[PDB]
């Protein structure tokens, strides 16, 4: 029953080919519900989930205004970081920001976060007390000093503990058919020879939501984690997710291997066997 709301922002500079490209998406748990693309024609925040379309024009006008505002800060931020790092305009660079809040099964506030990355590396992050910052390098310390003098964490903590929690609950209620479901994985194993003496064992989980899942292989009860191929959890395209784990084993030894599946939709963890 735990839930998150998260906003993700990406701005990428493109020297002498216009203003930076800004893309923004919003999620409730593993379900996208809004997008903004600075290259798209609408120049509006757009719905991406059925249950958010019911919001009135005040909502859409205001979220468009605010997301364009985020677009403008990240545009200044790209210039700021160029200065902090003595970088020219020969290069495209990337700023990323993520913030949001978590509630428990009781829908009361759990924790909040607000993070930045520059060119793929941690830059600065709000710590879990929502009072202090983690600055990754000397440039981010400069930001930290400015944000402490400007009392940035106070203002974020008020948003994260208030507005963020209240609208997460609203969205959870309005989209409860979509959001408050749990779809347990449908699981099976496949077997295919790779030679006259070896076979691929692959453990599948399909049609599950939310995306959180654990698949492990054991051999005679011993975890084979170092020997397992694990693909990244992937979307089916319909709001559910897929995952598999494979080992290559000696033909004859299939009965030693078991797959173990953990997901919140299963009353108990599953063990799949070759007998």
């Amino acid at each position: 029953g735990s839930h998150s709301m998260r906003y993700f922002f990406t701005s990428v500079s493109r020297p002498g080919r216009g203003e930076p490209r800004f893309i923004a998406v919003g999620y409730v748990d593993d379900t996208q519900f809004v997008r903004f693309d600075s290259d798209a024609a609408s120049q509006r925040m757009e719905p991406r989930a059925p249950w958010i379309e019911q919001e009135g024009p005040e909502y859409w006008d205001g979220e468009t205004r605010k997301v364009k505002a985020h677009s403008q800060t990240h545009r200044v931020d790209l210039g700021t970081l160029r200065g902090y790092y003595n970088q020219s305009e020969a290069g495209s660079h990337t700023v990323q920001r993520m913030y949001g809040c978590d509630v428990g099964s009781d829908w009361r506030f759990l924790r909040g976060y607000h993070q930045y990355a520059y060119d793929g590396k941690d830059y600065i992050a709000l710590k879990e007390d929502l009072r202090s910052w983690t600055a990754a390098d000397m440039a981010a310390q400069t930001t930290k000093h400015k944000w402490e003098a400007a009392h940035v964490a106070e203002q974020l903590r008020a948003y994260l503990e208030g507005t963020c929690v209240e609208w997460l609950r609203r969205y959870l209620e309005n989209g409860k058919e979509t959001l408050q479901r749990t779809d347990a994985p449908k699981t099976h194993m496949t077997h295919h020879a790779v030679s006259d003496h070896e076979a691929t064992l692959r453990c599948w989980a399909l049609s599950f939501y939310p995306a959180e899942i654990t698949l492990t292989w054991q051999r005679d009860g011993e975890d084979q984690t170092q020997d397992t191929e694990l693909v990244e959890t992937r979307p089916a395209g319909d709001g559910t997710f897929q995952k598999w784990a494979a080992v290559v084993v000696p033909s004859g030894q299939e009965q030693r291997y078991t797959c173990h599946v953990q997901h919140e939709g299963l009353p108990k963890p599953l063990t799949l066997r070759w007998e």
């Binding site: 979220e63 605010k66 931020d77 700023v95 930045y116 940035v152 609208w167």
Partner: peptide
Amino acid sequence: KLSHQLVLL
């Protein structure tokens, strides 16, 4: 909902 606060690095 989005935050109205302006945040600059």
